[PDB]
Structures are given as C-alpha cells and as structure tokens.
Design a protein around this ligand. Structure first.
Ligand SMILES: [Mg+2]
Length: 119
RNA sequence: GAAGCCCUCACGGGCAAUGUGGUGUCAGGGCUACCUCUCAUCAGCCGACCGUCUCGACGAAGUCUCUUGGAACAGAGCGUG
C-alpha cells in the first residue's frame, strides 16, 4: 500500500507466479525477506516478488527503492500465501527473489518488461 | 537458510521464510587463504565423603551398720565407680 505505487493486473500476477514455480525447479530462488534483500544487495537477483498483504509493512517497505537503485526488477503479488506456495513453501512469504531463472528466463525477462511498462 | 521445535505410543496434527535451526558474542565475530589444535566453554549422565542439626541404641558403681525422723537423700562408720 504505502510501498505499492502501481497495480499489477491479475493475469500478469499469474504469469509471474507460474514463472516462479518453474524457477524453483529449473533455476534458483530465494525465499524470505532477509534472503531476498541480500540478493538485491549482492546483485544476484533477477526478479523479486513482494506481497501486498504484509503487516507490518515495515518488513518490505525497503524492497522497492532498494531494487530501483540496484537495477533489479520487482513485481507485486496480492496474496502472501500464494507467493510462499509458488516459491515452494508450506508457509507464506512476504518476499521472494528468483536468483537466476530456469526454463523461464524468457517468460521472466518479459514479465520484467511488462512491469517496467506498467510504470 | 528449513538442516528446526511442540503435541501424540502411533497415525496424524500444530508452529516456522514476518526465519525454526546452524554459526557467533572484545581472549570481537563473520567471510577468504592458511597454522595448529581441542581440555575453554556449553549441553546432558552419574553422583558423594566430611561436616552440621535432630533423633535413637548401649551405658560403670551401696540402696550396708548405728542414731534422729512420718519418711534418710541427715549425722557417725564402712565400702564402690
Ligand atoms: Mg546458539
């Protein structure tokens, strides 16, 4: 909400999650806000996901601007439990980072484009 | 970075990426490359002596003489641990 400056259409979010699932199987992904933050800082992040139902918002507030000054692309997901399930967790996840996609580097790279265009 | 914890005989359930657990805590630590090494620390097992306080068992040698007296545990005499 305060850290969300653009709305991601339902369909875009699905493509994103889908890509994330093939990422945990084919490539590499980081689950959890602390491990995600470190990707963006270490530059190893290619696409970071951030839930929008995070309370307190403090936990994720920094992702956006941090991602911006690091060139890393990011996309918002409405449900926290969807991101966690997509990432492969039995629990939810406030943030995730596809650390080097897998059999999705295409669809992925394009999701990053659609979002950059989503302003 | 799920390698973790709780409940339950089990099955099974719950917690946990908003981080369970590993590492680590100024002899600073982590990371990288090395040297040596552990006897520090932490976790868990076993598990007292002595002392002190109280309680309890066992525990030596006269119940002799005369006098006074209601009564000798008194006086005089003899004897014991
Ligand atoms: Mg510890």
């Amino acid at each position: 909400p305060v850290y969300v400056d653009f709305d991601v259409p339902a369909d875009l979010e699905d493509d994103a999650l889908e890509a994330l699932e093939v990422a945990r199987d084919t490539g590499a992904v980081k689950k959890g806000t602390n491990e995600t933050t470190k990707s963006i800082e270490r530059g190893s992040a290619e696409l970071v996901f951030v839930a929008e139902d995070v309370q307190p918002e403090e936990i994720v507030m920094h992702i956006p601007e941090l991602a911006d000054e690091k060139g890393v692309p990011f996309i918002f997901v409405e449900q926290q439990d969807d991101l966690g399930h997509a990432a492969g967790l039995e629990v939810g996840s406030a943030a995730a980072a596809v650390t080097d996609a897998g059999a999705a580097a295409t669809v992925l790279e394009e999701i990053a484009d659609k979002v950059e265009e989503l302003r």
